[PDB]
Amino acid sequence: MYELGHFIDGKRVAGTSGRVSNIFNPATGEVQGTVALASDADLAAAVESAKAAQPKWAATNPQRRARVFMKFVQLLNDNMNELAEMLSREHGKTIDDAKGDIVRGLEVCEFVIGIPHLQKSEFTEGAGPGIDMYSIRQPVGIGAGITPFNFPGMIPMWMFAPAIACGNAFILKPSERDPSVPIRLAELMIEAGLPAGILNVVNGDKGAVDAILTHPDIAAVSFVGSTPIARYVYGTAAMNGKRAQCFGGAKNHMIIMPDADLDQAANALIGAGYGSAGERCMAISVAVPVGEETANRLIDKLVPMVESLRIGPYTDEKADMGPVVTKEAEQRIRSLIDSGIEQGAKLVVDGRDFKLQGYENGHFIGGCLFDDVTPDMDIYKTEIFGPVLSVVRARNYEEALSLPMKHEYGNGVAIYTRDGDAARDFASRINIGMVGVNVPIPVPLAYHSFGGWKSSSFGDLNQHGTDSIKFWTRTKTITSRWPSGI
Amino acid sequence: MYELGHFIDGKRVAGTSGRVSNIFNPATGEVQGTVALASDADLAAAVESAKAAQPKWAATNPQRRARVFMKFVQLLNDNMNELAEMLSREHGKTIDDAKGDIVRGLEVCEFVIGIPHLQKSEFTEGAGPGIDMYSIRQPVGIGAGITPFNFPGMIPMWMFAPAIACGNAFILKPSERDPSVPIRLAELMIEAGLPAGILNVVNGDKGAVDAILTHPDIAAVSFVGSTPIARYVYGTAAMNGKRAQCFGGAKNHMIIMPDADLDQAANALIGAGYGSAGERCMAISVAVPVGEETANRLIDKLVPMVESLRIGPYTDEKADMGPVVTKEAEQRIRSLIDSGIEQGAKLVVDGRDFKLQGYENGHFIGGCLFDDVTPDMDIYKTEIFGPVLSVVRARNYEEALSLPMKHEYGNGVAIYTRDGDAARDFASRINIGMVGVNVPIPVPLAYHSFGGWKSSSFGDLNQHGTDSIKFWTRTKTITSRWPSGIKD
Amino acid sequence: YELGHFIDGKRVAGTSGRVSNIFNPATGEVQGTVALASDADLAAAVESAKAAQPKWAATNPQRRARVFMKFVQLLNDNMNELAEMLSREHGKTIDDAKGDIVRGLEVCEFVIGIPHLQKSEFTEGAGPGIDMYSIRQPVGIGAGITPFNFPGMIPMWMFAPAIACGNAFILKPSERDPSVPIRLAELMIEAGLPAGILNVVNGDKGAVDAILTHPDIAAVSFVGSTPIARYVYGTAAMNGKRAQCFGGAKNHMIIMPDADLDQAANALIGAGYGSAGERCMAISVAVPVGEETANRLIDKLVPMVESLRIGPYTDEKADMGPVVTKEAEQRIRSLIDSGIEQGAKLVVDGRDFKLQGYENGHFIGGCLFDDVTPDMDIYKTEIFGPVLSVVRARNYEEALSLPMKHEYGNGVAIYTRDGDAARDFASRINIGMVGVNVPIPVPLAYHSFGGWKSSSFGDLNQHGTDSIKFWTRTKTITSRWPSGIK
Amino acid sequence: MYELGHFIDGKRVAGTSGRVSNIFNPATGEVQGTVALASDADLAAAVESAKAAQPKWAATNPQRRARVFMKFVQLLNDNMNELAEMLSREHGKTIDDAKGDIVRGLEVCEFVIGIPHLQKSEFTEGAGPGIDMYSIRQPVGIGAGITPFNFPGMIPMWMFAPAIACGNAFILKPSERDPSVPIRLAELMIEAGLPAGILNVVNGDKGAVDAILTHPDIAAVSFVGSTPIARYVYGTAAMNGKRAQCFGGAKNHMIIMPDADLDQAANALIGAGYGSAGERCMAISVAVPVGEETANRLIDKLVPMVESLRIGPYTDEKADMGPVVTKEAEQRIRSLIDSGIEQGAKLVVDGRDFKLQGYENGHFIGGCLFDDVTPDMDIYKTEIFGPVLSVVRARNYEEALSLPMKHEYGNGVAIYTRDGDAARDFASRINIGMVGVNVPIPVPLAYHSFGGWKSSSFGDLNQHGTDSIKFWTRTKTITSRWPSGIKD
């Protein structure tokens, strides 16, 4: 029965705020402890801490900065299990899923070890008569990052690694569903040799977010979450003159061509759709088999795989997928499911009544699969963020491609085929950020960049990779000339 | 009297609103010509033009795209000083200041000839077993630009040359004070073999601006102009979900260190201070000597040099500067130098007396040099944007430095010193985007980035150079794998 | 009628007193002579280049770029004139000559971007108050040897990057078709390149040697036979110079059973028989994978070869023309014979061809061999003539071993609709340039060109960014200050 | 006493060859041990080892390789002390100077953890109609490194880290004068998870060197050492069709301008001139004082500081200098010194007649300092590679600069001054690879590149940095199109 506060200046720290938010264990439904919710006062403190520390960290040379991360990765590996447990205990996802989650953040840390090279600027000589021209990439000062429940390990790291490594000081306002991991991360960071103040964790709600966007000393805000909040966070951030990147929702389609490997496809779909209980910005929502036989045979492969999915709490190491995050979330899922039924879709596998003995209060829904889904339906238009697979049947390639093309969401997409032509055209044309050819969850590695299109992002630079070093950095340009002395 | 409309589908086109705005000859104060003020209909038509036109352009390989700009460059060079009389007649700046203004723009178009190199994306083999991962940069679709009166040749090019090279289509909403130049450029692109629709020009005021900010097919907005307005244009752009870059205005300082070549500095102060009437995002607006001595000899250098400035119409090539742009602007300068006296500053060169014979209704105002400027004064805090040079005296280096540091503006800053250390320390810490060491207008060239810091910039990407390419493209990343096929 | 050299901005006759003949390969007989060059002739050119290079090095990258712009102007304005001189000397078609000129016009296009292409890296604060950056400065003076077949394209390949980097260039072209290189150098003065910067010296092995050992030359690039490459690279490196050399080729096309047979077949006809196949990137070996697909391949190949319109460059309707030299005609008629001697079956016999009015010109009918073996000399030596060899392969792994196992690695192609076969292939293959559903996969000027295995020596490619690497040398500066007036 | 052979296929292994070579302790002149000298059957075994091990390593993904190097780095910090002991014992420099050795190489290992991003290639979409074009950087295959005595840790890591991270196999033939360290680095790399076969140390003679240079399955050769030996290793490699980069000798000059902080110049000269007995390719051989009021005052600060030098064995942690590497190395330095007196030089500090109580017979030489040296002298022309720093008095900036300009060697050069103009002019014009402004030893860090000009380097790619990634990979360029197939 724990109380989590903030982490400001190198210490776990309770707020001055009266307010406190309670953390559930989603597998039992029960309250497990609480999160300090920051007040404007608490937030102002965080910035001050950041302000004081940042000049000197800026002044630490790139190689030294990177060695902090090299120790941080070592530390992370060391705490693989302990970090993975608190994460699974608060979020619901299997231990393996949490480890995967943390491994992915680690990988951006590995990437940022290369900051000395990643941060070099361009030089030119003889731009004029005796005139040299060169740029420098300097810190932006202080930055804030806002994080969702879905990844309370990987997405903070995604942002604070490149921001910190760049010489910035960073403030993380994470989700108050699972706030344990972000705080452990800040602690290990100092244990790795980060100065106090450089990475602060502040917990809270809309108040805290709003305090971040209005706060004059924070230059850059980074957001991942839902599209209506992202649109808000982006806009509000821009009004207060900050730079901003925001990443929102998804309704990700997997097109299956008649010539694809249906077995690989089927297996990919089962993992991509139901893994982590569908609770993912990069999960496959909608399968689009092309043609009647492909759609019949795909279904036939998939329903016994869905029915046999193993559902349990994180303490059950055999479980394929766990409980969803909250009772709010479970019910929203349940509502969508029944509307799928009301609108004429065929629920070929019905996980509505699954009940796990000794865990009745836990937020458990068995996996669900819909067939004959069409674009009018809400199960189509809406991101469900729950264990629900929609099969939409396409007559052909052109018809198939229209579906992801025309959806307001454009985060990830996958086409499954042997035909190079089919793949190149599709991956070429589709108005989506991240395209998987015979790959289901096409999330780029740390040294590339992640970002959707259309309604799934806002701004002009992605997350991690080369783009991130642009976001956390501002460019000085120097024009240099000399008169004769000696 | 001439009638300018918009430029849509490769054609000069009249507005559909009856709304019009006046274009003056700043030298003579009179009114030659008229600009159509775009309706929402007019704007909608430029967008529908662009929306039809771009895919096939997006589909032209980058080498063929490069070739348009190649030819376009030759075309400007052919129409160089037929294009410059145009600029000078509407704006007031001399044929040499227009000449460069266009040249600078033309350089962006030379930079963008290398779009095939420039637009390359990154590949990786075996990020995973059997697995390849690689980026591609694609057009964002349809972008738009809003440009101020000072530079109607250059800044449009800044925006549209990189936009269009990347495979996009563009709409330009220029300043209507001086809108001949923008339409001609659009007309020259056709002649260079640019598909119709890809570059549209739309004149208008705020109503057009808002029409752009809110149009759902316009993906990216680029703006240069006043700070307050930029801040508004940034905000709205974001609320409407677009990506956006905006660059505000300045109060650029120069720091003269004791050891500096006081001749070389004093010279550069006149030309950067008063050239183009002081009407620049990047002109020198404060002079900061370090020490009483340095001050004194500089003031003694400048005054005859300010006095002996030839002021007149673009039509006299002798002239070192000319008319301020509009009567509305010239009065806000006049009033600002008045607060210069009320506020305790000692004015040393007084150019309000100036009337160019017969030109009494021209927007002529001579040179103004102030001394003993304090931080408190309006004249120091506010962007005069006129032929008014303020001189602030600092006892030491650390204080000389404190001045541009503490200021709300932060586009440019120069330091004049023979000391390697003074120059490295200073350029290192100063929180200004463009930094000049012994150079008065540290404007980067087309292959570098342009952008100020603090309140002279909004957003995270800069103007021209590598950044523009990043701004006018969006990343796609492909992760790729195969199932064992006919090979086995 | 009599070509000499082009030294220091105007054509000059040589002191050597020696000459090479220039045949018109259509008629067969001589039409003009080129000066061979002495050491004094060669030395006078290095002295021009030494005089002009520092002031050329001085001019900024923008002004340097502008010369190339205007040189692309003029190159278009003389397209016609140029491809005419090239054709009557080389024997390549007027349309083929046009391609030759354009393919190097496009390198010139590339180097118009040298301002950005020459940028250096800068670090700030890599130690306390210590910066470090680099500058890419001119090598000094370059040299280039070009073979007979591309007197337009390959000289430009070399000298355009070399000269844009601020260097001076000495070109020693082929004394077979030498008019184009002078005209090119002459046209460069017209664009406003200083004199002495681009000088053509003509000659044989005697001139190569005088270049290979001249102390003021730093870099050397060569294309030609592997044996000459070998030695030029060998000799350069011994004289302490830096070298890039490119050699011979035996380029296979592998047609998979699922390829688009028409498209393929059509391609063999272009790439095997274009310009009588006088090319480092021509296709020489067809490797059908099916028994059935080798059968149909031939079925649609034979009428294609047979109906090849052969004619002198003056027949603008001809596909092909004369080989460059009486000597070459003999080499190839010798190789066609060993084919028949060694078991291969000539299914189109071209030896028989004589062209009315041009009976002594080096014309030779297309030759298609079948049941070719990898033990045969038509397979392992480079014909450089109008002769395509078809090697029957039973399977993919067996087909793939042919290009892999061959001493040459210039180009390769695979024709298939299977994304799998194409990627695995391009992935593993031994060869620098790989075409998938593409016959002659020469990379564009912004990319770079080079063979692997025996087809290239050194570590940098032609054109692209590699070319800027070769004509440049890095300086690195570490900079810092004592306390003073600050 | 000990016996070292080779590391081949994950193991310490004896050489099948008859021949062996002596390892001395330069402090005492004793023989501590013996290296085996490789025969061609010993090298061949190593090459087949690499041949078998390389494909699978190249098949491991960039992230997974970087990880090995990440581990290696922790292992270096773990064994820092054992390693410096072993190094210093054989070679003779301080434990402190050996720590540098390892750390300067360990930082190449850091640089390379980032290979996933470093090995990206370039992608281009629709280079033609429906044709994408892109390159892959696959490995070169099997490489080799031949390293001198002075840095038997730093310079192997220089070559093998880039090489291995690029998924290549490596063969290291280090200096047989101090071979304990490399084999340990090879062992340590096995601990880090590098597969057997991937890092092989082969110890040997010119017989080893030739064997490497003539082996059909080695694709690439890096060499550091003599200019004459560089030229040979370069020329031979090339005639066997390998690619090569060779790095040679040095005569590093330091120019002191009158406005320089002499206290600092002087202190720098102590470290850079004498540290590690001056057995560095980046050590300062020539002090070039500009003006005589400078020249006189430099010597005035310079003389006590030399004579104060503590000279001792690696075992005396207090010592600034150890012995030189061999009996032979000493005989030339003593010989060359006498040449100085013989030709005119003024020996203001005499190190000749100094031995050490208990360490007579160990190769010790007191620091020597010449004044009034000129370019005709031998101590100016030759690389001394011992504790002998020449002073050449230049009358002016221009004359001072001609000194390095004109020299056979162009490895490194420093200039010391407060003047921005002199720093820039010098750094720019000079024909030297690495340049220092108020920096004594301008060796770039691992993320930049190392390499001198003129006689000091060969080939067209430097050491470490993005250069080295380019040396250890070949480019393959794919051009891709598809025929309309199963899609509608």
Side-chain angles (χ1 to χ4, degrees), chain B residues 62-63 67 70-71 73-74 103 106-107 110-111 113 116-118 120 125-126 130-132 257-259 397 419-422 424-425 428 445-448 466 482-488, chain C residues 61-62 66 69 72-73 103 105-106 109-110 112 115-117 119 124-125 129-131 256-258 396-397 416 418-421 423-424 427 444-447 465 481-486:
Chain B
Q63 266 180 330
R67 271 159 211 151
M70 266 194 66
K71 175 150 196 211
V73 158
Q74 181 64 50
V103 157
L106 159 151
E107 282 176 4
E110 303 178 335
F111 162 64
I113 304 176
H117 175 53
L118 289 177
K120 264 165 198 184
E125 199 199 29
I131 279 152
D132 298 346
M257 222 48 213
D259 63 340
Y397 165 88
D419 192 60
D421 174 43
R424 197 215 96 108
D425 172 81
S428 202
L445 289 161
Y447 43 116
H448 283 279
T466 245
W482 309 88
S484 220
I486 192 168
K487 84 175 187 297
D488 290 302
Chain C
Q62 255 157 359
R66 294 195 166 108
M69 241 169 292
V72 168
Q73 282 301 0
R103 247 67 231 166
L105 162 300
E106 272 184 352
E109 288 203 289
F110 175 60
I112 288 162
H116 171 257
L117 285 175
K119 301 202 207 181
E124 148 154 292
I130 312 189
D131 289 336
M256 216 50 228
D258 71 328
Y396 166 89
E397 216 55 67
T416 182
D418 199 45
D420 181 23
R423 125 87 192 185
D424 187 80
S427 199
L444 297 173
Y446 48 108
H447 284 237
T465 37
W481 304 97
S483 296
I485 321 169
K486 170 256 267 83

Side-chain angles (χ1 to χ4, degrees), chain A residues 149-172:
Chain A
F149 88 92
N150 173 74
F151 296 93
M154 171 197 81
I155 305 178
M157 264 166 108
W158 265 18
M159 315 175 158
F160 77 57
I164 282 174
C166 275
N168 288 296
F170 186 87
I171 298 161
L172 183 70

Side-chain angles (χ1 to χ4, degrees), chain D residues 245-454:
Chain D
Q245 45 179 196
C246 298
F247 300 91
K251 199 83 196 179
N252 288 37
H253 288 38
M254 195 210 259
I255 274 78
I256 308 90
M257 292 290 313
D259 63 326
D261 191 309
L262 299 186
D263 301 304
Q264 297 195 147
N267 274 330
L269 272 163
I270 231 199
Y274 297 97
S276 264
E279 321 200 85
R280 280 125 94 212
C281 40
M282 289 288 282
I284 308 281
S285 320
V286 180
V288 182
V290 172
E292 290 224 311
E293 296 227 318
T294 319
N296 287 330
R297 290 194 62 217
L298 189 77
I299 297 310
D300 221 11
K301 322 177 93 74
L302 212 58
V303 165
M305 291 203 244
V306 178
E307 289 162 349
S308 319
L309 283 164
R310 202 197 228 258
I311 319 173
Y314 82 84
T315 222
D316 164 11
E317 226 146 71
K318 301 274 295 168
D320 308 297
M321 258 183 311
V324 301
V325 67
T326 57
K327 277 218 146 89
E328 292 101 73
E330 196 182 349
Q331 210 123 2
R332 307 187 241 100
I333 300 153
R334 300 195 151 283
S335 201
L336 268 153
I337 286 166
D338 293 29
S339 147
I341 298 151
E342 182 133 87
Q343 294 164 350
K346 155 75 215 176
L347 187 57
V348 272
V349 182
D350 203 338
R352 286 221 270 4
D353 232 324
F354 147 92
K355 276 169 272 65
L356 201 92
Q357 197 256 54
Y359 300 93
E360 50 273 295
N361 283 193
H363 328 109
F364 286 91
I365 317 155
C368 306
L369 174 51
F370 287 113
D371 188 330
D372 282 318
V373 177
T374 55
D376 47 54
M377 269 162 215
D378 277 0
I379 50 153
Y380 181 86
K381 301 179 324 209
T382 315
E383 175 167 36
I384 265 155
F385 229 65
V388 194
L389 159 83
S390 314
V391 178
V392 175
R393 292 164 180 249
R395 301 260 272 101
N396 54 106
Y397 170 74
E398 281 307 325
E399 144 148 300
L401 169 52
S402 354
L403 263 41
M405 200 70 79
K406 278 192 165 161
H407 202 102
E408 197 195 339
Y409 292 126
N411 214 40
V413 59
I415 199 189
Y416 263 63
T417 180
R418 316 204 151 158
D419 198 63
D421 180 72
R424 195 245 180 252
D425 177 62
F426 194 85
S428 180
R429 280 216 267 150
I430 195 57
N431 48 60
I432 275 79
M434 296 154 282
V435 179
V437 168
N438 301 321
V439 176
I441 284 169
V443 157
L445 302 166
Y447 47 93
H448 295 240
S449 55
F450 169 110
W453 300 356
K454 299 175 302 174

Side-chain angles (χ1 to χ4, degrees), chain B residues 256-418:
Chain B
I256 308 75
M257 222 48 213
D259 63 340
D261 184 337
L262 273 15
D263 262 85
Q264 274 186 29
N267 292 217
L269 278 179
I270 264 76
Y274 297 100
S276 274
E279 284 187 317
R280 300 198 189 125
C281 308
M282 285 282 95
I284 231 79
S285 131
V286 185
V288 165
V290 181
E292 9 282 281
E293 186 167 359
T294 336
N296 296 339
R297 284 196 51 173
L298 191 85
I299 281 132
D300 287 293
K301 241 80 204 279
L302 292 146
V303 164
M305 248 162 1
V306 202
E307 291 175 333
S308 171
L309 262 164
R310 205 42 222 155
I311 305 157
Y314 70 87
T315 201
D316 156 273
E317 78 85 28
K318 286 199 307 186
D320 296 308
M321 58 160 170
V324 145
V325 69
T326 55
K327 277 297 179 195
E328 20 143 274
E330 86 138 55
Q331 221 167 35
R332 198 194 143 267
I333 286 153
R334 221 149 238 300
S335 144
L336 229 30
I337 86 165
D338 282 351
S339 67
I341 297 105
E342 323 285 29
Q343 228 152 352
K346 270 288 121 71
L347 186 164
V348 185
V349 187
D350 195 349
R352 56 215 197 170
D353 230 6
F354 203 89
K355 332 274 318 101
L356 177 55
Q357 197 189 89
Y359 266 122
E360 279 65 353
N361 51 287
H363 322 129
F364 284 115
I365 164 171
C368 308
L369 186 162
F370 275 80
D371 193 14
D372 293 359
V373 207
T374 143
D376 265 358
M377 296 168 188
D378 275 341
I379 187 190
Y380 174 80
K381 295 213 284 273
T382 338
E383 172 159 52
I384 312 145
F385 219 100
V388 187
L389 184 45
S390 354
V391 174
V392 183
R393 296 156 160 261
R395 301 103 37 240
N396 50 72
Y397 165 88
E398 203 66 18
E399 275 316 300
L401 177 66
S402 185
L403 270 47
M405 195 88 71
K406 285 191 175 295
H407 202 310
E408 12 128 23
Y409 283 128
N411 232 359
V413 66
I415 204 199
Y416 271 67
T417 177
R418 294 171 145 114

